[PDB]
Write a protein that binds this DNA or RNA. Structure first.
Length: 270
DNA sequence: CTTCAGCAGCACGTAGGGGAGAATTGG
RNA sequence: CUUGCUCGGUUCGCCGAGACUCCCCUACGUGCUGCUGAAG
DNA sequence: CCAATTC
């Protein structure tokens, strides 16, 4: 499932300092800096509601308003898996060591030599873990957050979305887009590729396909032309679609990147 | 004024941990 | 094939050819940098 | 009709 990365036109607030992102951040730090005896003790995370009011009241991790189970269930499953990773890799390293350690023990029978000294075991911590990872700012969107067409929500159509650029050679001279008479015999004219600085050398907003993804009193309005463009080069659909139809191809659950100011979508299984 | 010594990264690889739903059932 | 990214052409009017499995983290590498200790 | 529940 390749991603269909789409830009952000406007946002209520940067993705940072956002209920889901901020509350996730607090969860992240607690889990990673835990003890192997405080992981199986402070972590009792259940896919229910009263347990996440129990886990968030026993671990002490704060919530500035986020209680949504569908988004507080993968957040608390990301951190625990990530912390599990930092012990898994060490165990695999130790396991790899004992895989060849048995292998060099097999050659001892042919060697007729004294057995090799025991291979040391790498310990993930010698109570806090050695490698406490940094927080993952990526924001994950769930079913109650899934995208919808922008149909005033605080210019879009779910009418059939325009094909766009229907006229190239018929533009009047002097108007934006006319092929010069000397080179007369699909990127729009405001494409930054054609006006970039080179060794020899609002329109986007007014010709947009705005979708919207909402999290409580928050929202992101991605430009679906990026989502449009993903379909048109893979061989899935044709010019006949709408704000409702394209979102059908792409997973209900998109991802978000606060830093680059870009959101990420994924193809569904089909 | 040269060998190397071992930490760090502006920048680079690899190498290895984590992640990228959605259909029902309550109030 | 409406946005966005890379690299080219031009009369600067936009034109030509492409990429698209990405993201997060820990850490370890190469010149470079720095801090030191050997030999005249 | 919108959060909590399921695998």
């Amino acid at each position: 499932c390749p991603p269909a990365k789409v830009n952000i036109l406007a946002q209520s607030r940067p993705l940072s300092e956002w209920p889901i992102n901020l509350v996730s951040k607090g969860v992240q730090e607690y889990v990673y800096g835990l003890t192997a005896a405080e992981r199986e003790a402070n972590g009792d995370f259940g896919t229910s509601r009263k347990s996440l009011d129990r886990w968030f009241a026993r671990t002490g991790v704060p919530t500035h308003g986020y209680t949504t189970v569908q988004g507080l269930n993968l957040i608390l499953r990301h951190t625990f898996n990530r912390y599990d990773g930092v012990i898994k890799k060490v165990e695999t390293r130790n396991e790899k060591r004992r895989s060849k350690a048995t292998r060099i023990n097999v050659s001892r029978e042919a060697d007729g030599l004294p057995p090799i000294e025991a291979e040391p075991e790498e310990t993930a911590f010698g109570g806090k873990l050695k490698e406490r990872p940094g927080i993952n700012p990526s924001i994950y969107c769930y079913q109650q957050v899934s995208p919808v067409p922008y149909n005033p929500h605080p210019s879009g159509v779910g009418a059939p979305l325009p094909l766009g650029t229907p006229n190239r050679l018929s533009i009047p001279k002097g108007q934006p887009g006319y092929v010069p008479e000397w080179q007369r015999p699909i990127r729009k004219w405001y494409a930054r590729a054609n006006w970039r600085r080179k060794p020899g050398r609002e329109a986007a907003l007014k010709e947009a396909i705005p979708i919207i993804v909402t999290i409580g009193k928050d929202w992101i309005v991605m430009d679906a032309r990026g989502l449009l463009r993903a379909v048109y080069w893979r061989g899935i659909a044709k010019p006949g679609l709408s704000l409702k139809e394209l979102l059908g191809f792409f997973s209900g659950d998109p991802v978000l990147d606060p830093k680059r100011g870009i959101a990420t979508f994924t193809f569904k299984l089909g």
